[PDB]
Amino acid sequence: IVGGYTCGANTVPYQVSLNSGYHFCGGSLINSQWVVSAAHCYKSGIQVRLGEDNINVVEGNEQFISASKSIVHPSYNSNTLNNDIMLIKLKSAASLNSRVASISLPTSCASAGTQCLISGWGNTKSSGTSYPDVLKCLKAPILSDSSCKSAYPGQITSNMFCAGYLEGGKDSCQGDSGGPVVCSGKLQGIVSWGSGCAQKNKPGVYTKVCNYVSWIKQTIASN
Ligand SMILES: [Ca+2]
């Protein structure tokens, strides 16, 4: 997250870190045994880390649970990033408490202008690299479709939305992918892609979760 703030320990209780020897992507806990992340984060050897603040220090609220199954969206296209969503099942149920909690799936899609909270452990610099130990946060509005398409000609599908600031300076970044965009207490987005980070006229692009609620629910119901 570039241009954000330190969230505060365990203030984003649905945020998970996906670990394969190190943090490589975010995710969101959606029930005691399932995480939703970005398909482009798929790999083998995933340990889900819940209850994290500093990802390099055991601070006492963590739960580390291996994945038993990962399910990339049936229509994910890695070249366009269309349908950039996956589900990860935990080998055992997380213990839910105030610091480790699921996030609601949306009942309806969100509108341009709505404020969201975007969070992650990704790079905090738009030129160069500095990766934080503690969770970072950014409040950002959803941008209109039309301005998203104008920023990224030929690249925005109906499964994507932009959020952030056309002036630049505030955005998600590498290492934030897969993490949450929460608006009005609902998971409306997944950190997906952008051109650089925090550049003028290049806001972040997010997977539009409301389009996937049916698939998420029926996948969970049979897996
Ligand atoms: Ca920790």
DSSP the chain: -BS-EE--TTSSTTEEEEESSSEEEEEEEEETTEEEE-GGG--SS-EEEES-SSTTS--S--EEEEEEEEEE-TT--TTT-TT--EEEEESSPPPP-SSS---BPPSSPPPTT-EEEEEESS---SSS----SS-EEEEEEBPPHHHHHHHSTTT--TTEEEES-TT-S-B--TT-TT-EEEETTEEEEEEEE-SSSSBTTB-EEEEEGGGGHHHHHHHHHH-
Give the integer Cα–Cα distance in Å for 216 and 105. Answer: 9
Backbone angles phi, psi at 164, to 5 degrees: 130, -140
| Structural domain count of the chain | 2
In 3D space, the residue among 88, 87, 42 whose CA is nearest the CA of residue 65 turns out to be 88
The encoded tokens of residue 43 equal 């790999």
Give the integer Cα–Cα distance in Å for 187 and 16. Answer: 13
In 3D space, the residue among 56, 60, 51 whose CA is nearest the CA of residue 29 turns out to be 51
Distance 8 CA to ligand 1 centre (A): 13
Both 54 and 150 in a single domain?
no
Diameter of the chain by CA atoms? 46
Give the integer Cα–Cα distance in Å for 171 and 210. Answer: 21
Distance 2 CA to ligand 1 centre (A): 21
Both 90 and 121 in a single domain?
no
Backbone angles phi, psi at 214, to 5 degrees: -60, -50
Do 5 and 119 meet the contact criterion of CB atoms below 8 Å apart? no
Give the integer Cα–Cα distance in Å for 89 and 93. Answer: 9
Q: How many CA atoms lie within 13 A of 164 on its CB side?
A: 35
Do 49 and 15 meet the contact criterion of CB atoms below 8 Å apart? no
Q: What is the resolution of this structure in A?
A: 0.8
Both 182 and 146 in a single domain?
yes
Distance 22 CA to ligand 1 centre (A): 12
In 3D space, the residue among 74, 70, 93 whose CA is nearest the CA of residue 82 turns out to be 74
Both 168 and 180 in a single domain?
yes
Backbone angles phi, psi at 217, to 5 degrees: -65, -45
In 10 A of CB 194, how many CB atoms? 23
The encoded tokens of residue 33 equal 């045994």
The answer to whether 145 is annotated as binding is no
Q: How many CA atoms lie within 13 A of 218 on its CB side?
A: 4
The residues that bridge with 16 in the sheet, in sequence order, are 27
Do 160 and 29 meet the contact criterion of CB atoms below 8 Å apart? no
By the CB criterion, residues less than 5 angstroms from ion ligand 1 are 52, 54, 59
In 10 A of CB 191, how many CB atoms? 33
The answer to whether 53 is annotated as binding is no
Q: How many CA atoms lie within 13 A of 161 on its CB side?
A: 23
Give the integer Cα–Cα distance in Å for 193 and 83. Answer: 12
Give the CA distances from residue 35 to residues 20, 23, 79, 170, 184, in Å, rounded to whole numbers and listed in that order.
16, 15, 24, 26, 20
Query: Could you tell me the residue range of the domain that residue 47 belongs to?
Result: 13-102+211-222
In 10 A of CB 189, how many CB atoms? 29
Both 4 and 76 in a single domain?
no
The answer to whether 57 is annotated as binding is yes
Give the integer Cα–Cα distance in Å for 80 and 163. Answer: 18
CATH number at residue 56: 2.40.10.10
Both 110 and 81 in a single domain?
no
The answer to whether 52 is annotated as binding is yes
Both 114 and 204 in a single domain?
yes
Give me the active site residues, please. Answer: 40, 84, 177
Both 20 and 82 in a single domain?
yes
Give Cβ neighbours of residue 60 (< 8 Å, ≥ 6 apart): none
Distance 156 CA to ligand 1 centre (A): 36
